[PDB]
Design a protein around this nucleic acid. Sequence first.
DNA 1: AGTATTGATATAAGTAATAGATAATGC
DNA 2: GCATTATCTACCGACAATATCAATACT
Lengths: 918, 339
Amino acid sequence: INFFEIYNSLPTLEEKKAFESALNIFNQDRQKVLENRATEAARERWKHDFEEAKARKNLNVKLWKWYNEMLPLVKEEINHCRSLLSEKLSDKKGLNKVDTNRLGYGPYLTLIDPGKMCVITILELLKLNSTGGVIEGMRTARAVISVGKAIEMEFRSEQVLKSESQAKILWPQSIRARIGSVLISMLIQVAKVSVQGVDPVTKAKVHGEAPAFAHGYQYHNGSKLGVLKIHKTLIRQLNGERLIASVQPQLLPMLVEPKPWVNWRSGGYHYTQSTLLRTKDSPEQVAYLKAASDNGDIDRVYDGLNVLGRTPWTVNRKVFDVVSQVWNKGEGFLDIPGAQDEMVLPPAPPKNSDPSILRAWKLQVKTIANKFSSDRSNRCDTNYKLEIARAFLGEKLYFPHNLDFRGRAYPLSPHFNHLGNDMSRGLLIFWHGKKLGPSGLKWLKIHLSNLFGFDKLPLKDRVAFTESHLQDIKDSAENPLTGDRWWTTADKPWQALATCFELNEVMKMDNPEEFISHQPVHQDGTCNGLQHYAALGGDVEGATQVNLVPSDKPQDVYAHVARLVQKRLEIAAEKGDENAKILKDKITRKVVKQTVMTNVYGVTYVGATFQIAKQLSPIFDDRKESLDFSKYLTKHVFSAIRELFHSAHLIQDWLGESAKRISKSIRLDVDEKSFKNGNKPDFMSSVIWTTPLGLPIVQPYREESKKQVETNLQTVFISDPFAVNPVNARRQKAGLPPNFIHSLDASHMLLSAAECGKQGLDFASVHDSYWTHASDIDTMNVVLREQFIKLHEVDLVLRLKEEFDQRYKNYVKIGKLKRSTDLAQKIIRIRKDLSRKLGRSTTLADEIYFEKKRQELLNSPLIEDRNVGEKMVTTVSLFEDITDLDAMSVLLPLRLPEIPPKGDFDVTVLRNSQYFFS
Amino acid sequence: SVPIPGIKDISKLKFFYGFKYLWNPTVYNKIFDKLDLTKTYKHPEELKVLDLYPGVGIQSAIFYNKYCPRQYSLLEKRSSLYKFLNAKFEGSPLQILKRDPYDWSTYSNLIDEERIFVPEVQSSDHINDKFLTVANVTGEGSEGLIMQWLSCIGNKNWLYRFGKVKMLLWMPSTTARKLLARPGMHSRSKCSVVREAFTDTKLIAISDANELKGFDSQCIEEWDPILFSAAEIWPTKGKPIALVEMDPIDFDFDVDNWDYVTRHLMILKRTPLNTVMDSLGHGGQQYFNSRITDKDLLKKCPIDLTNDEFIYLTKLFMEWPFKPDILMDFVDMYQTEHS
DNA sequence: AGTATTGATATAAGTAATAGATAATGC
DNA sequence: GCATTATCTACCGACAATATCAATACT
Ligand SMILES: Nc1nc2c(ncn2[C@@H]2O[C@H](COP(=O)(O)OP(=O)(O)OP(=O)(O)O)[C@@H](O)[C@H]2O)c(=O)[nH]1
Ligand SMILES: Nc1nc2c(ncn2[C@@H]2O[C@H](COP(=O)(O)OP(=O)(O)OP(=O)(O)O)[C@@H](O)[C@H]2O)c(=O)[nH]1
Ligand SMILES: [Mg+2]
């Protein structure tokens, strides 16, 4: 039964609320069944389909054949392990499996049911297709690790269910791999598939049986890569009509209210526990998050996440019908690539041709293969989404959120959510419906104008556009297919279709103010990354250029750069240039958007070339391998914007210099005793700061400590999560300028979400884009401006500088100075002092160790004890007399640069600007 | 006649870019006597020699002194050595070209577009009598270049479209050990197979006494290289070097399928052939077990296989009805972004 | 006398691939 | 001491080399 049909039919909010409460009490059981006994449902579907096919969907028939044939081997494998564990000790055993290997992974196999293990391994292999960059398969290490992690998750769900029904802590990756290797090594020999071949000599067609999966190796730039490959028959099976129940996600959206976030390790799903941060690679992030959660410094983060999570959604109906009709057509559409069977490759050049020609042909073939596979992947993903929305039609679904290590919120359900592409954004609406009122109609018109790409004009122009095109709106909404299909011309078609639906229903009425509209209306920040620099350095020109100060018409930075580049090319194309004539009119704000965006984040020349090259292909100004225009365009873009953002570049360079200085600092405690590896020590200090909302941000960039661990298939090259390694001084200097700004944006989003949730709105955010009902846009805008003013009223660059200074007090850098410079000369005298008392020449480690105890002496609570220690003058203590530190090797204090001067800009003046968010 | 550079002159150059050159005229005279170029080039007066990476150019001076070919072209672009070449060899028949041998374009841009150096094409049944190539790729960085040229031998496209062009190559001793490894030795790899299939390489000289222990004990008997020491090469801060005479030979096999089969067989070079063929495709072990009657071949590891057996396995692979597509054997990672 | 880690070297071959930071070296 | 050559990575967002082998370490 489709409960959404009943919900809209009720007359008054009282009956609706009673029905919703009863529905939640009912849906608790459905959610509990869904989370715990989902794989048994897949087994039941496999068995049913097999029985039906035998009595009188081909993929489901085969899967039960493998699972029923794999199961005997697993029961034999576990029995062998238990035999060795039954006997206490056996000194002499064959090194093959019984000596150590079956003792290594013995206990971990005995945990869960063998049939469950078979189901998990089949599902995990079938999900990992065309991942890691293998053409028709996957990487072996990722496959075995994923299988092991899935087995562990199933064990902990079963364990918690047993513990809460009757009334190591985490597996090492040297143990997770072996379980997956054993299961996959059984499945490789179990699986079979039927293939049709053509004889090369006699040209006689034959049939045969071949293993479904195989294991091989491949090489990229002089390095092997173990891969698992899938027969083409399975691949072409995986692009059929639909896949009803064979591969169902284990982390699909909830049916009831999510568990509120009350701690850093408790929230989200009922039977499943999820950590606040997505980055589980580093342990230091976990340590700092636990420390900050114990006190309770991040209550605002909890509030924002709770407000985001508890928004009820529901699957759109009419758009689902339209998509179902388009999918059944079997032909390529707006973005659905269509079912292509065989791909096309140009004829190979004669082998006598110059090697450059053959290399170019190989590059072209590589490009063609990536497109064909990228298209197949898109089609399969669209089919999977249409599967997920099918079973959830007319159902209430909630999206819990978590964070990455900076603060940006991401839904837990990876496949079907509102962060997906345009089609996924089209199949979702709000369950709670609001009357349009005097403003909802205008805001819905503005939303349609936004979705049609015309969101750079004033508001009156957008309303005029929609009022003019009302006829096409009705024409496209009545019959989406076999009509004029005006909604296909839109920049975002699968949302403009729903907007046209709602506008048509509205205009078929006589009173717009009585309609209940469920369509979310976006409000995206314009040049958000530059808005944060404008508010940080207090630049008036920068604030004007990013729609901060009140104005009359929208201003943007990317269109300005596009016009500059266009006139540059036009001048160039008028003096006889050949490439500029082609690119004379092909430059728009979309082509030059991400290069202007990421210039202030530190984008490289080659990264910019690939950005612009990726952006050229959708308009096919050239072909896929015509990347030589992109180099010219990026050179012109950099030349044009060489002298545009100066206030922003100052903060970018300050953050870069600060990160470089921190990454080369040594604390006195870590250098407790020389490692004797070398005179130079290791650097283990990362860059850490705190969000304005209290959250700690630790950059997890450290050198890799990978090693090869043997499995049944191969020896996989994996890392040690517990290892602490010297920091990556290249990525610490490159990640700070983007990470700081993204954390600022995330904090602003969390503040705004919390306030809007308290005020009663339905809220949902996508980075800089915030959604709400068509009738709540004015209140939401007021909240946005108020929270931005609250965030940026206090100086943040200076606060960051003070926090760094108070976090890295007793940290020492290493540098060089002239042996005859008087400042450096005096240390040599101190270097001579240890020759008698210590008995040996003074060294770097000893000089550092000397100051370690003096800090304890300085902080001794006794005043008499302070005089004992404070009188000493160490090598570091020489520099305390002066401050001009810029102008052998000597230790130096960790001094951070001066903050860029702050301009005279008032942040409150934006509270009346109506183009800040639009 | 030609003023040969001396030790007192090549000692002033500051940068050698990792390359090491021999400068003792006695060793060159012994080498050029051992090579015996007069038994294959009947008329050196009509000979064109292309010399790549000459460096100091002492070998070029001696070679021109002894034989006096009609055209001797040096391709060098590294600035420090180019200055020395330009200054020392002024007013000489040797012509110096400021182009980089690494690029694929330069050769064409110098042989077809502007006809600076046009050789004489000959048939593919005898060693070309109007074309000799001399190369000095000694740096550890420039090892892929040797393999690219060695594959261009098989493609007959780069400089071997003129015939069986003979090359005299200076290369690191480790590269010589890898290339000249007979079946079963510790140094056997895929480059040894390529050398076996495409070339008949003979070691001429080596600059270390101990390095001979790595090579095959028997084969040295048939070669007797001209042993010298590391005191006659100027940049002594490197590794021992070696000289080899390469010349193409005919063949009849599918280059692409043979390349695929050898590449995917030599990864597991020590596992027995009983279970290494399972990596050449989906269900390849059963097919190759059905089509190999003798059980002896299925016992030898890929490190023990002679190139003839590799060609036999290639022929078995080509007649397989269910052979995979060898074109799509690559990893696309920078290119691929998965939603 | 015996296995068992443990570090080192080769692998393909223009890495898509080119520009700028950063380390290194020689006289 | 500075100046030319060598090495390395590619803005951020949770996801990746492997086999063979001497060589010593060490039950
Ligand atoms: N470092 C980095 N940040 C990005 C990138 N793309 C988007 N962002 C960030 O995510 C935000 C999303 O903004 P968008 O709506 O995509 O674009 P915009 O800069 O606001 O400009 P408009 O298109 O005018 O809205 C940006 O402002 C950046 O802060 C990228 O490639 N690199
Ligand atoms: N952090 C980060 N986010 C990105 C990057 N590229 C895209 N995104 C995000 O992906 C989202 C989808 O981008 P689009 O497909 O262009 O859709 P959109 O958000 O409406 O942006 P426009 O179409 O340009 O208006 C954006 O909102 C970005 O926030 C990136 O490189 N880094
Ligand atoms: Mg934006």
